[PDB]
Amino acid sequence: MKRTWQPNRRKRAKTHGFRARMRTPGGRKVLKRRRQKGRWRLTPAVRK
Amino acid sequence: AVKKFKPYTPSRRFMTVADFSEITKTEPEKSLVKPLKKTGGRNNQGRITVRFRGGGHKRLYRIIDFKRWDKVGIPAKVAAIEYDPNRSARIALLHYVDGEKRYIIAPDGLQVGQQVVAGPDAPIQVGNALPLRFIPVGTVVHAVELEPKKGAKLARAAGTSAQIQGREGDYVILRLPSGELRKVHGECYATVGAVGNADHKNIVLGKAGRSRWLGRRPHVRGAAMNPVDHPHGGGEGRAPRGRPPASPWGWQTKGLKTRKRRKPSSRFIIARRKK
RNA sequence: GAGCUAGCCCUGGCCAGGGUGAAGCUGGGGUGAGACCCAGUGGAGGCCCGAACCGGUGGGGGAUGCAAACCCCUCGGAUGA
RNA sequence: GAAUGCCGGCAUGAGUAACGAUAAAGAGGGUGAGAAUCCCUCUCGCCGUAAGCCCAAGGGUUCCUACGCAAUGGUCGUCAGCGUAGGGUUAGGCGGGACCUAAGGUGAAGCCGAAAGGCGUAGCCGAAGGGCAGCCGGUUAAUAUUCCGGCCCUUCCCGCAGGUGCGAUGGGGGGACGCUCUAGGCUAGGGGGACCGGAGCCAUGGACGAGCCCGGCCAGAAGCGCAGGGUGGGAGGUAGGCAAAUCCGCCUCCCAACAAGCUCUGCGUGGUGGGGAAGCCCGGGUGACAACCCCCCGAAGCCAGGGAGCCAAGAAAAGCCUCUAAGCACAACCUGCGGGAACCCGUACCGCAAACCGACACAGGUGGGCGGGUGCAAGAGCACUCAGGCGCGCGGGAGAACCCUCGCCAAGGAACUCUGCAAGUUGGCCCCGUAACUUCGGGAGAAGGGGUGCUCCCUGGGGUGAUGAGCCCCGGGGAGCCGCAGUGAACAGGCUCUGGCGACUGUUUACCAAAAACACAGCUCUCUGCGAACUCGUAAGAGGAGGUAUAGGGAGCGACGCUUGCCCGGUGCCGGAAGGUCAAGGGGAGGGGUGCAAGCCCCGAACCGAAGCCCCGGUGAACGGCGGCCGUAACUAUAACGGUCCUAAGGUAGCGAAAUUCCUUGUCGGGUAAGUUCCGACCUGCACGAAAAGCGUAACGACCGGAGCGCUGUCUCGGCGAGGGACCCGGUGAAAUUGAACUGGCCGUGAAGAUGCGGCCUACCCGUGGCAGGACGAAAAGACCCCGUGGAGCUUUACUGCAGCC
RNA sequence: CGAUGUCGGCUCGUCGCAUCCUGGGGCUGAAGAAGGUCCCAAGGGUUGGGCUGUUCGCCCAUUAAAGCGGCACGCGAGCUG
RNA sequence: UGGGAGAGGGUGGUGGAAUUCCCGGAGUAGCGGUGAAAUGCGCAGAUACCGGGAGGAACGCCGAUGGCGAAGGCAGCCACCUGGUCCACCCGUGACGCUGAGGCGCGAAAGCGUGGGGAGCAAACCGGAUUAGAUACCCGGGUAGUCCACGCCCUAAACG
RNA sequence: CCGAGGGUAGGGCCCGUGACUGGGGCGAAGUCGUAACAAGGUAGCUGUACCGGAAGGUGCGGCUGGAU
Numbered sequence A: 001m002k003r004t005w006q007p008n009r010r011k012r013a014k015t016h017g018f019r020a021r022m023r024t025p026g027g028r029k030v031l032k033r034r035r036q037k038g039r040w041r042l043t044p045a046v047r048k
Numbered sequence B: 001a002v003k004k005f006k007p008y009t010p011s012r013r014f015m016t017v018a019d020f021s022e023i024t025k026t027e028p029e030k031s032l033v034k035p036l037k038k039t040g041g042r043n044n045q046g047r048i049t050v051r052f053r054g055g056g057h058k059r060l061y062r063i064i065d066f067k068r069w070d071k072v073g074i075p076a077k078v079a080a081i082e083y084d085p086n087r088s089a090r091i092a093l094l095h096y097v098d099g100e101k102r103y104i105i106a107p108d109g110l111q112v113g114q115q116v117v118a119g120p121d122a123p124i125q126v127g128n129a130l131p132l133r134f135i136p137v138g139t140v141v142h143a144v145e146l147e148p149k150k151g152a153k154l155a156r157a158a159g160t161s162a163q164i165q166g167r168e169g170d171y172v173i174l175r176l177p178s179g180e181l182r183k184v185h186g187e188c189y190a191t192v193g194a195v196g197n198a199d200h201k202n203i204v205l206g207k208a209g210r211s212r213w214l215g216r217r218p219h220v221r222g223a224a225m226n227p228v229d230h231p232h233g234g235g236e237g238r239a240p241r242g243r244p245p246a247s248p249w250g251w252q253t254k255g256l257k258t259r260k261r262r263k264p265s266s267r268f269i270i271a272r273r274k275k
Numbered sequence C: 001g002a003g004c005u006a007g008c009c010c011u012g013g014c015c016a017g018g019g020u021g022a023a024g025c026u027g028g029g030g031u032g033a034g035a036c037c038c039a040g041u042g043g044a045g046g047c048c049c050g051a052a053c054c055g056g057u058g059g060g061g062g063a064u065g066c067a068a069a070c071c072c073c074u075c076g077g078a079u080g081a
Numbered sequence D: 001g002a003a004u005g006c007c008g009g010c011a012u013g014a015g016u017a018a019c020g021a022u023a024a025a026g027a028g029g030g031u032g033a034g035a036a037u038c039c040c041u042c043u044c045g046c047c048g049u050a051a052g053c054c055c056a057a058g059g060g061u062u063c064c065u066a067c068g069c070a071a072u073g074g075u076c077g078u079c080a081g082c083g084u085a086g087g088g089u090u091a092g093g094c095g096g097g098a099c100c101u102a103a104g105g106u107g108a109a110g111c112c113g114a115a116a117g118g119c120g121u122a123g124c125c126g127a128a129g130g131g132c133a134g135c136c137g138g139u140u141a142a143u144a145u146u147c148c149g150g151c152c153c154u155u156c157c158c159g160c161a162g163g164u165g166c167g168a169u170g171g172g173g174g175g176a177c178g179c180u181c182u183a184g185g186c187u188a189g190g191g192g193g194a195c196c197g198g199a200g201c202c203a204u205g206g207a208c209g210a211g212c213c214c215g216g217c218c219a220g221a222a223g224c225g226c227a228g229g230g231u232g233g234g235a236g237g238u239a240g241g242c243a244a245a246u247c248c249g250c251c252u253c254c255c256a257a258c259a260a261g262c263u264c265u266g267c268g269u270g271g272u273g274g275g276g277a278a279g280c281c282c283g284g285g286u287g288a289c290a291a292c293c294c295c296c297c298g299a300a301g302c303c304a305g306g307g308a309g310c311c312a313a314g315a316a317a318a319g320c321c322u323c324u325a326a327g328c329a330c331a332a333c334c335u336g337c338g339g340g341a342a343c344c345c346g347u348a349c350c351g352c353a354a355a356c357c358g359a360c361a362c363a364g365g366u367g368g369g370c371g372g373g374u375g376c377a378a379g380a381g382c383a384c385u386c387a388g389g390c391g392c393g394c395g396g397g398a399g400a401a402c403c404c405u406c407g408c409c410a411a412g413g414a415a416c417u418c419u420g421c422a423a424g425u426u427g428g429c430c431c432c433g434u435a436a437c438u439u440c441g442g443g444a445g446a447a448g449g450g451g452u453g454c455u456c457c458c459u460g461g462g463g464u465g466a467u468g469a470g471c472c473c474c475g476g477g478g479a480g481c482c483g484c485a486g487u488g489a490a491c492a493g494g495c496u497c498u499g500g501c502g503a504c505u506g507u508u509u510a511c512c513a514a515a516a517a518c519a520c521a522g523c524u525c526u527c528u529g530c531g532a533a534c535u536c537g538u539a540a541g542a543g544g545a546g547g548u549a550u551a552g553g554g555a556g557c558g559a560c561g562c563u564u565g566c567c568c569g570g571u572g573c574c575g576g577a578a579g580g581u582c583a584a585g586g587g588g589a590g591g592g593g594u595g596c597a598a599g600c601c602c603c604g605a606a607c608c609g610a611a612g613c614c615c616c617g618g619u620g621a622a623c624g625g626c627g628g629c630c631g632u633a634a635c636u637a638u639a640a641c642g643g644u645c646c647u648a649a650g651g652u653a654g655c656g657a658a659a660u661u662c663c664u665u666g667u668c669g670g671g672u673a674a675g676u677u678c679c680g681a682c683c684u685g686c687a688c689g690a691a692a693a694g695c696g697u698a699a700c701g702a703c704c705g706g707a708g709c710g711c712u713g714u715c716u717c718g719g720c721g722a723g724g725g726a727c728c729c730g731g732u733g734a735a736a737u738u739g740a741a742c743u744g745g746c747c748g749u750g751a752a753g754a755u756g757c758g759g760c761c762u763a764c765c766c767g768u769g770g771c772a773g774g775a776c777g778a779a780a781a782g783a784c785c786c787c788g789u790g791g792a793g794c795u796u797u798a799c800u801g802c803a804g805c806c
Numbered sequence E: 001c002g003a004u005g006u007c008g009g010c011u012c013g014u015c016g017c018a019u020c021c022u023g024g025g026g027c028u029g030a031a032g033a034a035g036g037u038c039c040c041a042a043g044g045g046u047u048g049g050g051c052u053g054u055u056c057g058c059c060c061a062u063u064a065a066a067g068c069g070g071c072a073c074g075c076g077a078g079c080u081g
Numbered sequence F: 001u002g003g004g005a006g007a008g009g010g011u012g013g014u015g016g017a018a019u020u021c022c023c024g025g026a027g028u029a030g031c032g033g034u035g036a037a038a039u040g041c042g043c044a045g046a047u048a049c050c051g052g053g054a055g056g057a058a059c060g061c062c063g064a065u066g067g068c069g070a071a072g073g074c075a076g077c078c079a080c081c082u083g084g085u086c087c088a089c090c091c092g093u094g095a096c097g098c099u100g101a102g103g104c105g106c107g108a109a110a111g112c113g114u115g116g117g118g119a120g121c122a123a124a125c126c127g128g129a130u131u132a133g134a135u136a137c138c139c140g141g142g143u144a145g146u147c148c149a150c151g152c153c154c155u156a157a158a159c160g
Numbered sequence G: 001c002c003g004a005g006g007g008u009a010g011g012g013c014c015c016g017u018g019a020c021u022g023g024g025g026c027g028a029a030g031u032c033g034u035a036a037c038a039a040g041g042u043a044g045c046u047g048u049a050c051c052g053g054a055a056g057g058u059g060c061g062g063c064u065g066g067a068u
Ligand SMILES: [Mg+2]
Pocket: A001, A002, A003
């Protein structure tokens, strides 16, 4: 059938992108946490 | 005269459509339409706050001249009678001798080719807008302001009317379409005549489709739901209400009066409504 | 988290083909005028048959599957909610 | 040493199942260490509204080439979407940006919120919508509307010439719009040609032919030609388009109005630039100076912003035009010409799939365009085929049971069975004909029949053209021919009668329920006078609605027809300016503490004191409720009739052994050989009943019953046959499970059902194909049941709070 | 209770005998035929249908007869459901 | 041709009396009702009186034993639209007439549908009385409906 | 070819009969009430509507075939 993952570059960056995270308090804490843990990537890779 | 159809489908059996015998112009006035933005019953938080809304035909909003005290003593001609999908009434297009063009909602008996006028001096004739204090007692009237200069507010649905019962001070006594008696200020404007298209109540939507066309999504009985959804939820099988009939939200839907008791317009409601 | 799913909003798109043949219209009849009658034209419809498309009724298979819901035969809707 | 322990390692099942659509293969010749699997050829089969082609999204080098075969590939591998390396994506015109706005988002003004933050007009952002300038061919191993050739065009700058009141975010016009149906004329595409060009071919009995086979075009600037769209012209007045305004809007007059005039498109032609087959011979070359013409069909695309009808009434903004304001009229704009200038990003390749979503090269999912011919009424259906693309990444045998998918069947014909489940029957078309009932539409494809091929002959209309021929779409008549049989293959209804339930088309438990459930028009009650009620939110603010009682919220009922009875005592709701009860507060008889005293401090009775409750009313399509015993008629039986107890009132109409009836398969009737079901009745209704509606109701239904016809492998009752498996050989090689096992039967015994204990019987060791009685077989720490002072959803006149409202 | 799948059916049997039939008998209110009752006897046999989910039961038409029980109310790693 | 009478019909308008209701004042222990009662209503201020307002229907006197119409039937007043009818004059046509199966139209009340309306009245229904009972007559309430529009129904002691 | 007739399917008319149900007629001495005939103790009849064990009652409109 139709599965759950239907990639969509515009959707990916607009929902999980760096700018979507920076806007909201909970977004920044995300970026702060993943920085504290040391993630190589702070948001999903999406081609644009 | 509302039109019937032969029973050549189950739904055509009872379905009735308006006569449209009064419409003279079949496309609107481009200078007087806006995009009427459909909500779907969703507020600015995006929440369904009014239920069972959405999905109806696309519409343009016809700007309607609900003041008319803009243009005192300027005669306008009735150039057309047009279909408006935003209200039950029909609308009339006014070419003012000014050159200015406006829509008013069309009273009953109004004819393309005649002339209307707004102001304290206007003849007491169908389509003229006057302050309330100058309209003679007893004349039916529509498009009635409720507070001076705040815009026509009452008797704007098709077929409806208001009647000037008496005078008292700076106030006139109106029998609104609901049969209540209220005080409205005399400087409030009102328009001579009832609203046209009374046959509107006699329309039979004939099938569920036309309801969906009007933006009316299917209403679900509370009895049919589950208790997490509604006071009438559940039961094994069908079930009487088994408690005072309640809305989805708890309050009692039978009888329970709901107007504010301390509302300042109480000093101006003379009598609650009828039937 | 609404890239699944539910509903709505904005903007686009899709619906082979055949069948039935509403109103109206014209003529003709009828009449005091009407109603109504007949033929033709007309092409209405949550109309009819049926692909695409949308479904998922019955049965069989499948059952460490081709598949964590599939396959085959059958069947429902297919201009409309 | 056990924790269904944790991490790892390695066993068992086992050389077992399997190796992923039953579209299918065979051979020759290559290559190489090695070949069913790579390359080439010939033959065969498969898709062909796809299984071919072109976009989009997503993927991100996977593309092309050389070089490879450890791993990946379900086998093999010399091959590869794999490994190493090199190469490869070229734009003013294609798409996107330097343009436009949509929902939405954001957000100077502003508003609100303990903080975080929430709002919000403008404006900004935001696209597959609007706007905008490139078509044809050639070329690379791989990019091409991008490179190149040919012919076109756009904007910016600057110059020149001519013209003009120039000038904009300002004003206006325009952009600018639905649905069904649709004309005229074209184009896309297709069919035929006895005409035109072509390498040839003559077979196996005939044919040297009006024979066969192939092909007969594409793009094109201005002019012109055909077809369309858009479009009044002038004048005077003018108070409106938030300044202005010759524009626009409004009024008056002459004028031009099926016209035309102008302009804008499509189509054709068009200098010119290309293309060009089979076949033959190494993608090449030839063919070839290739020819490139005629007739027909003909779009759903184009002209287009076309026409008509309809109701549910069908975006915005920019471009573009027009108007003027500051300004400036040495400027500026317009037209024409010339030169110059013209940026960023994407472009490989896959793309119904082995490259995307599904952990897999996974029978699943994925939006748009093109989708050729013949025949079958039509069609994108079906069969077969073109172009093109494939044979599905294990094979070779054998020809058991059994399994799946499939074909047939003597006689019977539902006897099968929970049920004709399933499978038959029927099957398109044309014609004849067609019932109850009905809301007059329908029921209807009702039912049931006849026809259907081919040849010859005679003919009616329609389309093109010309009014003829030809082509072409519908027919009609007559005489015939063949077969078992002419929708000869493929696609393509079984019918009926009768109940129940729901009016109907719709909707639903994604992944066990499609239903009688939801919904539905329609009916009623109730709330709401607008800063509405109601909803969401702390609020601001939103929705409601830019709506106004013919409207909007809530609730039940559920088309329609005929209907909808009695009870307001209780609960609710509604009304009630009295009475009663009632908090804070007021009031202050009177006491209390303390101080030498003024004082300070405390307690405090009467009485005034809202809402709510009490009380008085109303109210049922508000929550609900609608009796018991005894007796009585001149056969009996039974009670129209009476007696009395109780109630707030004792169930009306209609219906009833029912989707409800317990006794129950009630009784009687019909159907049947036989009928716990069915239908029709009766009425002692355990326990129908009137908008949780009551009784009906045409039509509808993948709903649930009962009967009949047809026809059958469902059955008596099975038989044979087909292929895919199972089986055997070569290759790859899992799984749950598993205390260890050297694991028989009986009768006993044992924690009460023993391979394992006792006694007896039986039994050489080890396999293979099979079947399932046991291993209280396996997967699952029973979901039933109970227990836990475990949990959660839900309820209410349980308790206690809180939101909200008063 | 870290699961012993539960009605009925179908399929496949097998066992018991307190015997439905068939075979041998005694007694009889056994004349014959035909029965009744009891004794021996498990070898074999013990049908097809309508109703119901039914086991059962009732019925139809037959029959030599239309036996009754056990086998985890035999039998779902055999099917149905 | 010229006149006359008439509630003949249709539409729109509009006048006053009375009833109920609402509002203000004023006023108090009962009103109402019957054969007598009671239900009912009234100190939460009724009845009785004054002023005010809304709404409906029906039109007193005139009114008659009258008029009109085909019958059903039609009654405040105004205007519009329209039928019949009668009379005078003796002008016109020249038997054009009578009836009338069928057909068509009209047709009290009640009733039916869809809107509206709703004062008073009132089937049904409820209550109080009466009675052996009283599903009645009598009393207090009261829903259709009576009324408007359109469309049905087509009955009658539709009678002279 | 026509053709008695036979078969298949679907209609229309008629008759008989059917559990049960609807009223109707008639039947020496049943039960209930008293509706009508007098003002029949509510004048009565009437068309219609609703209602009630039954006769009847009530509403509406009409008739006199009504009385004083
Ligand atoms: Mg899905």
